Each structure stands twice: as C-alpha cells, then as structure tokens.
Amino acid sequence: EQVQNQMNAWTKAQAKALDDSMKSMNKLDVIDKQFQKRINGEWVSTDFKDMPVNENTGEFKHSDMVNYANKKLAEIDSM
Amino acid sequence: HKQKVTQELPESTSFDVKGIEQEATAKPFAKDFWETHGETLDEYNSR
Numbered sequence A: 001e002q003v004q005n006q007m008n009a010w011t012k013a014q015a016k017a018l019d020d021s022m023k024s025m026n027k028l029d030v031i032d033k034q035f036q037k038r039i040n041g042e043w044v045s046t047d048f049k050d051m052p053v054n055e056n057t058g059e060f061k062h063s064d065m066v067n068y069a070n071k072k073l074a075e076i077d078s079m
Numbered sequence B: 001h002k003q004k005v006t007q008e009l010p011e012s013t014s015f016d017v018k019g020i021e022q023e024a025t026a027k028p029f030a031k032d033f034w035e036t037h038g039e040t041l042d043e044y045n046s047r
Helices: A003-015 A022-038 A063-076 B029-037
Strands: none
Touching: A022 A063
8 A cells, every 4th residue: 555655656757758748749740730731722830939839739849840840751751 | 767768869861852853964056066967067058
C-alpha cells in the first residue's frame, strides 16, 4: 500500500509526458491542415504565428514548423 | 533512475527537387553553316 501510492504519482508523471508529446503532434497536424487548405485553393495564412490554438496545441513556436517542413519533404521522398 | 534523453537525433532533409535539364548552348548560326556546308556565310552570298 506504499507502492500503490507511488504508482498514483508515477502515472501522473507519465500522463504529463503524454501531454507534451501529443501537443507536439497536434501542432503538426494543424500545420498540415493549414497547408492543405492553402493548397486546395483557400485563403488562410500558413505562418506559424497564425495557426489556431485550442489548449490541445498551445502557442506555436518556430521550431514546430521546421519539424513539419523536414517531415513533409521526408514523406514526399518516400513514395 | 533511467535517463530520459536518448542519443536518437532528429532528421532534416534537403529540398532536393529535380525538374528538367536545359539544352546546351546550340552552335552559333555562323559555325552551324560552317561545319555543315564547309564554307562561311560570306563565301556563300558571293555567288
């Protein structure tokens, strides 16, 4: 009944680690959706400072576009 | 405690796009006439 009390905290520290790595995937998904709405012929900006933000993503940093930019090119190279 | 930092590194890729190559510098019309009709343009109009 001490190890149970330890797991109540270790699980909280694992859910706070799948919160900061699902944010960093939400941001790439929304950046892809922005690029795709811009390509298919719709007038919405694609700067990282103009994405939408909904507490599943947080504020967008610059490095969350670099990451995306090297990941479309990586995916297009593999087709 | 396990180190939560792996030697695994992030990967960026080059914007390597190849389109269509260009045709080389085609010969000048004077040299064209030369190595095809063996005589320059001046020597062809003198007739």
